Amino acid sequence: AVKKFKPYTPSRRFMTVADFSEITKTEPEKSLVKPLKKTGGRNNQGRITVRFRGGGHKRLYRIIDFKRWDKVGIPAKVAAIEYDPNRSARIALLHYVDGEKRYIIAPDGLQVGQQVVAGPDAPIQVGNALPLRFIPVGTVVHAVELEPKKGAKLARAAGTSAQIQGREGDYVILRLPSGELRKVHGECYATVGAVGNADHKNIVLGKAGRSRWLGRRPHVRGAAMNPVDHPHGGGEGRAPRGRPPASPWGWQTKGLKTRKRRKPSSRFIIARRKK
């Protein structure tokens, strides 16, 4: 659960922090970190293409194993669970009896010293990876691939998961975190269990300073600008939107669906999301 502070500053009154309980090792494996290159929201032209980015804490990118079908049958002992700054989930360090060392995203309930393994023959226990065809209907999985051997794409953030719902030919039916119902190829790998650190969302940043530490620069409202800047700009005094509420670039921003309707994956999405 999340940690509160006494109100000994105005900002400590509401600031909350992760308890970091499941963490067992405060330093990253030297062979598995590499320098993450700060973009600031800028691209190869040097132009901002994602606004209000940059200035956050320096990080190294811990390499994560998003395949696991790499090493079928080769078990590994769960050696440590660590803090990864590049993602909301925690990471777990695996010592393969191979000798090889790898990170995965740490599932809910994964215990240090436990063994896990990937494969068609793997047991149905948290931390194990299998093609979806061999996971019992109804069990909840994470780190799901979208296509075979292309990497884990779904159910990766703190506390999230997906549930197998049924089998239709070469494909399985998943309920994605978003409530969407989607077909996924059965030969896509997953990992039984939900992603851990489920309290991530109960955290209260507490002060503007904290957002800055995360690389989030301040966001400027359209209504606070001028006509040259934004559809919502101008007006004497404050002003209501006075048009359909729009983006900085003029497209409507309350309800306008933006998925390409002729996308080939539509053939595989059973039901659009809930909530």
User: Which of RNA, Mg ion, none has residue 273 at its interface (CB below 5 to 8 Å by kind)?
Assistant: RNA
Q: Which ranges in 62-174 belong to alpha helices (H)?
A: none
> Is residue 255 close enough to count as binding Mg ion by CB under 5 A?
no
User: Which of RNA, Mg ion, none has residue 236 at its interface (CB below 5 to 8 Å by kind)?
Assistant: Mg ion
Residues in Cβ contact with 163 at an 8 Å cutoff, skipping those fewer than 6 apart: 138, 139, 140, 141, 174, 175
- Token pair, residue 108, equals 């809910």
Stretch 48-77 residues interacting with Mg ion (CB under 5 A): 48, 50-51, 53, 56-57, 61
Alpha carbon 51 to its chain centroid, in Å, reads 20
> Is residue 186 close enough to count as binding RNA by CB under 7 A?
no
CB neighbourhood size of 164 (10 A): 22
CB neighbourhood size of 84 (10 A): 21
User: Which of 178, 36, 154 is closest to 105 using CA atoms?
Assistant: 154
Span from 116-124, 126-134, 185-193, 199-207 in contact with RNA (CB under 7 A): 199-207
For RNA, give the closer residue by CB, 114 or 211. Answer: 211
Stretch 177-216 residues interacting with Mg ion (CB under 5 A): 214
Residues in Cβ contact with 202 at an 8 Å cutoff, skipping those fewer than 6 apart: 1, 2, 16
> Is residue 112 close enough to count as binding RNA by CB under 7 A?
no
> Is residue 67 close enough to count as binding RNA by CB under 7 A?
no
Span from 2-10, 117-125, 127-135, 185-193 in contact with RNA (CB under 7 A): 2-10
Q: Residue 105, CB half-sphere, CA atoms under 13 Å: how many? A: 31
> Is residue 157 close enough to count as binding Mg ion by CB under 5 A?
no
Q: Least distance (Å) from RNA to the CB of residue 136?
A: 10
> Is residue 169 close enough to count as binding RNA by CB under 7 A?
no
CB 204 within 8 A of CB 14: yes
Sign of CA dihedral 224, 230, 234, 240: negative
Stretch 231-250 residues interacting with Mg ion (CB under 5 A): 235-242
Stretch 5-64 residues interacting with RNA (CB under 7 A): 5-15, 17-18, 20, 23, 26, 28, 30-31, 33-61, 63-64
**CA end-to-end span of the chain, whole Å?**
25
Residues lying near Mg ion in the complex (CB under 5 A) = 3-6, 10, 13, 17-18, 20-23, 36-37, 41-42, 48, 50-51, 53, 56-57, 61, 214, 219, 221, 223, 235-242, 265
